[PDB]
Amino acid sequence: MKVGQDKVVTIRYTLQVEGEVLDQGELSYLHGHRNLIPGLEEALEGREEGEAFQAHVPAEKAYGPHDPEGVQVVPLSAFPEDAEVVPGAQFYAQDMEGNPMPLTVVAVEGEEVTVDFNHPLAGKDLDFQVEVVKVREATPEELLHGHAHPSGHHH
Amino acid sequence: NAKMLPFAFGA
Ligand SMILES: [Cl-]
Ligand code: NI
Ligand code: NI
What we know:
A: about 160 residues; four-stranded antiparallel β-sheet; B: little secondary structure; Small ribosomal subunit protein uS2 (chain B); peptidyl-prolyl cis-trans isomerase activity (chain A); cytoplasm (chain A)
């Protein structure tokens, strides 16, 4: 059966950025509920089970452009211990109610750390290889919760 | 978007 609104879709994928394979795995998602980046959902629409294809998804329809306002300059004191506050290191800040907010360290100077709260793939065009493994109808509880049970990565 | 699959940073 074909990918479409309110179907639970299982895909296998490889994700490459500028010729480097960054990710590879399998996931299930509820289609048409903003659970998957829009360019990839658009590429999958109407595809039959068993189809496999390659797709280029520009940043605009993936994780979006890099937002300059997501780059902040914070005190080194906010970082614990003396941890590894170096470029590329990932940390989590928490807001007033405890929500974890991931960041990547960009630079360190004096008592100041430049950090980036943008998604690591913001501003990147993404090259996928995708195989449609399974398509089924969603259960009532899946459409109520808005997500597949279970959702996300098999592997 | 940052939470969307297949590559979820979080937020
Ligand atoms: Cl889902
Ligand atoms: Ni909340
Ligand atoms: Ni196969």
